[PDB]
Assembly symmetry: C4
Amino acid sequence: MNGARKWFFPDGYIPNGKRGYLVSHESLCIMNTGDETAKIRITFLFEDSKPVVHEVEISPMKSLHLRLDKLGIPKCKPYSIMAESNVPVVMQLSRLDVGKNHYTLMTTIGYWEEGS
Amino acid sequence: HMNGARKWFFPDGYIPNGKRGYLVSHESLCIMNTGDETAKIRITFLFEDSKPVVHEVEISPMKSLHLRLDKLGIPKCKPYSIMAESNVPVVMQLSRLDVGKNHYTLMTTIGYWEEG
Amino acid sequence: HMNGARKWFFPDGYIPNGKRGYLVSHESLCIMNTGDETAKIRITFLFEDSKPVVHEVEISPMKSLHLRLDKLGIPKCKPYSIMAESNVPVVMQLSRLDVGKNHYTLMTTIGYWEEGS
Amino acid sequence: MNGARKWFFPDGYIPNGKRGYLVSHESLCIMNTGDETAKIRITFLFEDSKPVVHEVEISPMKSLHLRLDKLGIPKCKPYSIMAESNVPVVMQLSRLDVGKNHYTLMTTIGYWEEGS
Ligand SMILES: [Cl-]
Ligand SMILES: [Cl-]
Ligand SMILES: [Mg+2]
Ligand SMILES: [Mg+2]
Ligand SMILES: [Mg+2]
Ligand SMILES: [Mg+2]
């Protein structure tokens, strides 16, 4: 099976703090253990705005740590993620919240469905 | 057709009382609804030696909702657990921000799900 | 229809030894019972080079229980894993607070479940 | 049998910071509640490099907190993990990111498949 075709992450938020050259961010980590390249449609849902959809690809037997703070998503704006792939993959979302006086990480494997 | 589950569970609930400037410790129950109908969600809070308390919230179609649990009248520094039941499938994640004059940390997890 | 699963697993267990003020480093095995019957839970601790240690707890209907694992006689700073078995479906989450004079951090995860997906 | 034969962790990364005896690392925690020793093949996937595979064993009714920073994996290089066992097991991945001025933990149970 090598994963699932749909992944969901309800708690999305790009903090705006930084420390030196290290900036707060979220990384949507995706892995493809299959033999086919994965085309993934990433839908971002907001609290009072319409959805925004991005697209990425990940080659066979490769990892991809996608920096969500580089997609034009407004910083400090709550959102949720729905990712749909044409082939099974596995995803995990991690957040780094840093500032002059703080530095913390949090992570979770996502909720999955479709060819689990 | 639809994505998610109707029931979500989060055993580790706790609202810290620490404050850091204008920032206050809290927990955010993040919910996403990828469906076409508004989700009506009943959130039940279970305690260790007190009876349950139930709240209600709604999330519009294709929207995200980061619910601040520290704004519901739940006693601070009181362990609890959460059972959330929706009329339509949704996805949930619970995150906690514990902050104080000398600390700042985050933790999160996708919840356990049922019926979806 | 009951909610939860009868078996829960948490591979990363560890009780840190630091403290700060009123707080001490610890792990909290949080369990919830949304059913109509009391849950009798057998908690097994597995170690890397030692034999298992088993504890027992009970949780009444529609109640929460945040079990402090640092108060069970488990050696501090000794890696372990947890297998929990309940007579009725429940839901569990494990969280760790690692604190000291110069650090304070939390981590958590819903556990892996079996028999009641 | 308790557990699953395949486990996946998309967000792998070994930080390079240290603080005294403390060294940043990731611990792949595995538990075997079965009666037979588990032979586990751990595959590491990278963003622009080929996979690297390691092997470990875990005795019956034992825990194993595997230090991933002791396997020759380049530090500060994103990767993902796929672990395959001949018998059912359960896995969790935790990261300690520590330095002169920070100390933080994050963790998640992994995505699983081929499990009872
Ligand atoms: Cl975490
Ligand atoms: Cl998690
Ligand atoms: Mg922290
Ligand atoms: Mg954390
Ligand atoms: Mg910290
Ligand atoms: Mg987590």
